[PDB]
């Protein structure tokens, strides 16, 4: 199935020119720009791996695009996303986050039902690929 | 006499600690605007039944509200804007009941005043600082959902009522799986003979977890905890919590104290708290009496709710877009700047209280998305009715069309396309890769 | 660099919401006052271990304290007054721990700063408005005691320690019956092998009720609830309550959080809350390090205690009278006005927080009453030691002399006698109708 | 008279049950050391306001503190060491408030004494036996962490303040994953408008569990439970517990009673309890007034905290290394032996109370590790600031360099290399297999 | 026994000239001046009877003194006190209260001990004269 | 990934001569010396298998080194550690613990998130190799 975390995940995968235009947006919003990657795609996995540090005070999308493609080469069978952080007072947080690479195939999640008191159930989801070590995923 | 009793003071200087109110006053046929304002001021403070020795045992002046400014309503010879100041020490800290009791209660005027509407309030920084503000707030709610840079999507379950727990969960599951971020209980659905609340909550949680496992997203369903007594609301809130719900809802009709009680509970238990407030309550399109919705927005942001319905500009609700923009600012901005066209009469610092999320609900569809993004911005929950459930291809499909249209419009906004002018072509380029959207667009363009 | 890192800003404009601190700074031999101030500012905020990318994820500037003004201490070439501003959003509402942690904790300076004392704080109105203030306060305490227009009189039980419950109650009863408004537990008397707390409380209540029945007055004994854990303090507080005590006491050494917890308990249970603070704690006559007592006075009035020892000018404690007058004002006034001679560096509005009662304790006797009324005013508890217990005629008699001297001086003050100049003749006219006072006056004039 | 009233007894024999104090006394210009000591003794016990019959109802002598020894401070003609004995029955069992109230409170001296510092205490075995001691202790803490034979590594989150929950968790996760055993909340970070406490705790737990899964180690984050009232601290402590945190922290400014209450809670709930105490609190580099830190170390080990900041010798804090070694011994040893150079004035048996872990924090970096191991030993938490976060290669990398340097130095210590002399070559041999360390070493040798 | 409620009750009963000087004080403090009387002298009897209303905006002590003496004549076997009320913000309360008449003899109070749980006692005081109706007191 | 349990796990694997010098340290500290092994590398697995008893009163590192190498031969695809126990009063516990053998490859751990009340999660880590029986690990 398609994982729909991300601002634009209901659109087709973004081309490099679309990606360029989103970097331009972030630049004009004056965001820090980070590249993060993971192959544990759980919705509560808040901390993907960082590909380098976020880029601050950026003025040209090309160095951002170069690092996206370097991450795509090093980590092609990972989810890769671009995050825009705002330092604006009373926001101080991500304001955009979108997928720039998906594995070729997504098996999805297992649903676990642990039966509890009366009719209540305690739920877990476990991404199928996480039943394997990191280097065997996707 | 009211103007001669202290209540009218044209020379009064407002302090940073004063609570200020702006009333739209319509004076009795042949009564003076100054006396009218004075009456309103003198009624919402120290009621002068003439001669009272016991006043001289107190710092009397302090407790008297001051009418300090009167302007003629521009475009209405018979109506006036009266600005009234209240000392901060009159008000119980942290209490909306006390604030509302103080201002709109005492405020009479039988002999001088024909009609009165409260238009706006300037709550001073030090007063606002006594309230919790939103339990969660926009920034934290987005961090919990891992959802950034776009409006959120929701809809109410259709039909409102009558589905069993199991068939109710079915709708919730289909809609969530199809694309929506949230589904909601109707404000009418509490606990009734056709369906009691525990089975609803139990089947809903199954739907919500199924939908998260099918999408890899955080999903939510606003479980309505509205009930007749506090203990009953707490019981319903406690099951939502226990079962791991991300969000609950309450109806504004529970009233201020139950709202504050619930806002504190949602803060203490990591729960998003959506407030339902009727967009077309009989108490709606008034120009004469009552209070304007911007005042409700201020008080509810102070009380501490996380979502409130704020209006659309388009669709079925026929709002003045600039007045609406004014409701959004009240909810979202850290500082409000006077702007008479938006109906904001005072500058106001929000004292770092968290942001409330506006909700746009009411006869909206996927073909208006450019207008919706343009008028309402990206911090909003857009709620679509049979705009989802009544897609000829299914609930999932209806959800997908709305979600694609939204992402496509936000992508064009970020690319700096003139998405307001080129919005229809943007939707049509999106529908090209999306049959559900193609089907949605054809339906609401052929007639409706 | 600290002056070049943001921390020194001579051009900064203070806001009504800023928390301000005045430190007496002694810079390292051969270091600049500007760099010294900057160091203090930069240490009590964002610690610059050089280059940190994560700062750029936040509104960095907001969190940095600003050194904005430096003056040379007048009469001391090597010491400087550094004024530092802190944004209100740094501070937890209602929390003294957080305030003190923030200000005097982070504030380092190893390489630039040799010594540092905190002299004064400007707590902004909106911050003060987040604290309860005194549980009772002066006005309410006087209404509960039915005691107006004079200082209150107290003394500690002598000996401090060793009396059984029954012999302890005896002293309490004699002293109260003789004239004193209050008797007190020593700060050392908690619960010990020579006497556990429950029997003390039980015999004290009998003494206190006997004394009210013998005088027709409200009487009180400060039962010390100081203990090692909160549950234990609560147990002791709960027995004082149960037995109908008007007043309890706590020791400042329990620390800030137990104090706030107790202040809220005393508000909720109609109990006057006296705080014991050592007048000559090893941490006393400093000019170099620590914090000045006026800051403790501000924080304790905010925390919510009802009495605190504030000093005398005369007697055994050798205070500068104008500095002391400054401690009293901090405790009692609704607004403080800058006055460098009193050591008040900031104007400060108290935001209608209740008044704390100063306590004057320490080597005072009935022959100084004119000086005591003149320096300390009528809102004060005067505590006399063996000034009462060691009257040759008995404890009752010692109490009576103190009480007569007090009433006689207040009567002369109200008549507009120059009671400071004619104080000895006033006491001597009173002693004429009062043998216990005659006996008291002879004793403290023959030698002592 | 004080020397003639019982308070000076040169012939007194100390008992194994006495509580002893050593004060550094500076007598009033032209007052006798014997009278000065006597004054201090007579003030911290039975206050002689002359003639009190009620003393003869008690075993008076028992309650009087005895000045029994006076020595001239060697190298200071005007200062004296006064040794004072207090009977054990004066003190409430298990109560730090009572101990501190008794000793440093009552202790006055206006007329005889100019300045007074408390230097050391001899708590007798039977008294110490009434206190819990560390909730966990060093040996148990290492068994829970499965970490033996080396210091532990930590750092505070940078920036101190301003990061949202999610970006805050990011730092915690990177640092822990990179090598650190612990990350910590700043003492200032409680619950504030930029970030409330529940979201912090929730994201931190995710970071901590992610880091354990990435390393196969036990990881911890000191969640700060410091709050204004006890109920609030308990709520924060109860969420740390619920979420499975190994460790929490409190600020010394909460004060003694909240500390004891928390120490008992941490014992009862299997939680390591770190105490934050400001290394450069305004109340720091005194020689004149106050109390020496070794006394705080004794009382906090008795109260029952598991970690306390004890100082470095090197780095930014300019400590006398032998005085510091004395603080470490107080915290760690089962028996203390008098040693005047370390500032330990009494032998003291610790009565099998558990060990507190010293924390070294303050301008330390990986290039000083040989000095750190040599001065501070292996039972210590070393906390590095922007020594980690501001590594040009990332937080993970900064953590790795510190961790490698530490292991390499401990390995050389165990091999019996003269690691103090050959420390730089040891670090350089380690950096050869470790780029992050190579990068770390170049940075702090080029200038800084 | 002598009841020692009042600011000056440890002094001898005030003469008319002393009373005059205290009215002057209150006048210069700008107080409202009340005259209250009672023959239930319990310390928790907060509400004595008012002799007329308080006098506001007073400038001459003579009318105050006249009403004190009129109350003394009408109520000679009562406690009579003079109260000064402040309207100053953050005070708004009595700031002086003193006796200007006492009954010729004071019998005092009964102490009642109702025994409660363990060793605790619940206490009441009852003025002896209150065992009689008002018109039979003192 | 590298498991970093152990005193020296951030250093390269110890040579036999380094191992010898650490035994000498323990000998001069008068420790009991144990050899323990496991292929369930969970951080809360407190009880590894013992290879023989601890060695007491040891004076020559050679017999310790011989048993380390015998364990390495019998259990090469296990974690093997050396532990030093102190019997010193108020310690009575391990004071050093370091790895002397690791499997050739470490797959790491699975993170399980069971969703609980509100936003709280109950966490488990499960070493991937533990999804297999002991004799199939590493
Ligand atoms: Cl479970
Ligand atoms: Mg709605
Ligand atoms: Mg006192
Ligand atoms: Mg620390």
Swiss-Prot record, chains A, E, F:
GO CC, alphabetical: chloroplast
Subcellular location, record wording: Plastid, Chloroplast
Any one biological process term the GO annotation gives: reductive pentose-phosphate cycle
Note, other: In this alga, in contrast to plants, the small subunit is encoded in the chloroplast.
Family: Belongs to the RuBisCO small chain family.
Subunit details: Heterohexadecamer of 8 large and 8 small subunits.
Protein name (Swiss-Prot/TrEMBL): Ribulose bisphosphate carboxylase small subunit
Species of provenance: Galdieria sulphuraria
Protein's gene: rbcS
UniProtKB/Swiss-Prot annotation, chains B, C, D:
Function: RuBisCO catalyzes two reactions: the carboxylation of D-ribulose 1,5-bisphosphate, the primary event in carbon dioxide fixation, as well as the oxidative fragmentation of the pentose substrate in the photorespiration process. Both reactions occur simultaneously and in competition at the same active site. Carbon dioxide and oxygen bind in the same pocket of the enzyme in a similar manner.
Residue numbers annotated as active site: 158, 276
Subunit: Heterohexadecamer of 8 large chains and 8 small chains.
A single GO cellular-component term on record: chloroplast
Cofactor info, note text: Binds 1 Mg(2+) ion per subunit.
Gene of this entry: rbcL
Enzyme class: lyase
Entry-annotated residues carrying N6-carboxylysine: 184
Keyword entries, A-Z: Calvin cycle, Carbon dioxide fixation, Chloroplast, Lyase, Magnesium, Metal-binding, Monooxygenase, Oxidoreductase, Photorespiration, Photosynthesis, Plastid, S-nitrosylation
Reactions that this protein is recorded to catalyse: 2 (2R)-3-phosphoglycerate + 2 H(+) = D-ribulose 1,5-bisphosphate + CO2 + H2O; D-ribulose 1,5-bisphosphate + O2 = 2-phosphoglycolate + (2R)-3-phosphoglycerate + 2 H(+)
GO molecular function terms attached to this record: magnesium ion binding; monooxygenase activity; ribulose-bisphosphate carboxylase activity
NCBIfam families for the chain: PRK04208.1 (NF003252)
InterPro entries attached to this UniProt entry: RuBisCO, RuBisCo_large_chain_AS, RuBisCO_lsu_C, RuBisCO_lsu_C_sf, RuBisCO_lsu_fd_N, RuBisCO_lsu_N_sf, RuBisCO_lsuI
General remark: The basic functional RuBisCO is composed of a large chain homodimer in a 'head-to-tail' conformation. In form I RuBisCO this homodimer is arranged in a barrel-like tetramer with the small subunits forming a tetrameric 'cap' on each end of the 'barrel'. Although originally identified as Cyanidium caldarium, these sequences derive from Galdieria sulphuraria.
Protein name as annotated: Ribulose bisphosphate carboxylase large chain
List of residues binding substrate: 106, 156, 160, 277, 309, 361
Listed SUPFAM superfamilies: RuBisCo, C-terminal domain, RuBisCO, large subunit, small (N-terminal) domain
Residue sites binding Mg(2+) per the record: 184, 186-187
Cofactor(s) essential for the protein: Mg(2+)
Residues with site note (Transition state stabilizer): 316
Recorded family membership: Belongs to the RuBisCO large chain family. Type I subfamily.
UniProt-listed Enzyme Commission number(s): 4.1.1.39
Organism of derivation: Galdieria sulphuraria
One GO biological process term: reductive pentose-phosphate cycle
Modification S-nitrosocysteine occurs at: 155, 434
Record localization: Plastid, Chloroplast
Main location: plastid
Xref: CDD domains: RuBisCO_large_I
């Amino acid at each position: 199935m398609r994982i729909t975390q991300g601002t634009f995940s209901f659109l087709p995968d973004l081309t490099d020119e679309q990606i360029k235009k989103q970097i331009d947006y972030m630049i004009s919003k004056k965001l820090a720009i980070g590249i993060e990657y993971t192959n544990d795609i759980h919705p509560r996995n808040s901390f993907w791996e960082m590909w380098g540090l976020p880029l601050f005070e950026v003025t040209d999308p090309a160095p951002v695009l170069f690092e996206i493609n370097a991450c795509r080469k090093a980590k092609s069978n990972f989810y890769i996303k671009v995050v825009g952080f705002s330092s604006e007072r009373g926001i101080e947080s991500t304001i955009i986050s979108f997928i720039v690479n998906r594995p070729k195939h997504e098996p999805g999640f297992n649903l676990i039902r642990q039966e509890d008191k009366s009719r209540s159930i305690k739920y877990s989801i476990q991404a199928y690929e996480t039943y394997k070590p990191e280097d065997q995923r996707y | 006499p009211y103007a001669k009793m202290g209540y009218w003071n044209p020379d009064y200087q407002v302090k940073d600690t004063d609570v200020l109110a702006l009333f739209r006053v319509t004076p009795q046929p042949g009564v003076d605007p100054i006396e009218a304002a004075a009456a309103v001021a003198g009624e919402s403070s120290t009621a002068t039944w003439t001669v009272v020795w016991t006043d001289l045992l107190t710092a009397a002046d302090l407790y008297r509200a001051k009418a300090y400014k009167v302007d003629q309503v521009p475009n209405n010879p018979e109506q006036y804007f009266a600005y009234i100041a209240y000392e901060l020490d009159l008000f119980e800290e942290g209490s909306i009941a006390n604030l509302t009791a103080s201002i709109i209660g005492n405020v009479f005027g039988f002999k001088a005043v024909k009609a009165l509407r409260l238009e706006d309030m300037r709550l001073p920084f030090a007063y606002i600082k006594t309230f919790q503000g939103p339990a969660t707030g926009v920034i934290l709610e987005r961090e919990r959902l891992d959802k950034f840079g776009r409006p959120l999507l929701g809809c109410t379950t259709k039909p409102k009522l009558g589905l069993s727990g199991k068939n109710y969960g079915r709708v919730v599951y289909e809609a969530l799986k199809g694309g929506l971020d949230f589904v909601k209980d109707d404000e009418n659905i509490n606990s009734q003979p056709f369906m009691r609340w525990r089975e609803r909550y139990l089947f809903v949680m199954e739907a919500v977890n199924k939908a998260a496992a099918a999408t890899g997203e955080v999903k939510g369903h606003y479980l309505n905890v509205t009930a007749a007594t506090m203990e009953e609301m707490y019981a319903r809130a406690q099951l939502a919590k226990e079962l791991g719900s991300v969000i609950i809802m309450i109806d504004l009709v529970i009233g201020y104290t139950a709202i504050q009680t619930m806002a504190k509970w949602a803060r203490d238990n990591d729960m998003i708290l959506h407030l339902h407030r009727a967009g077309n309550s009989t108490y709606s399109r008034q120009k004469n009496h009552g209070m304007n919705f911007r005042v409700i927005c201020k008080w509810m942001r102070m009380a501490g709710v996380d979502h409130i319905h704020a209006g659309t500009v388009v669709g079925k609700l026929e709002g003045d877009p600039i007045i609406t923009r004014g409701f959004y600012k009240t909810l979202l901005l850290p500082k409000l700047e006077r702007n008479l066209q938006e109906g904001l009469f005072f500058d106001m610092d929000w004292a770092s209280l968290r942001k409330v999320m506006p909700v746009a609900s009411g006869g909206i569809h996927a073909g208006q998305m450019h207008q919706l993004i343009h008028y309402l911005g990206e911090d909003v929950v857009l709620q679509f009715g049979g705009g989802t459930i009544g897609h000829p291809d299914g609930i999932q499909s209806g959800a997908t069309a709305n979600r694609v249209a939204l992402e496509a419009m936000i992508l064009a906004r970020n690319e700096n396309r003139d998405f307001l002018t080129e919005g229809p072509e943007i939707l049509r380029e999106a529908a090209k890769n999306c049959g559900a959207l193609r089907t949605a667009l054809d339906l609401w363009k052929d007639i409706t």
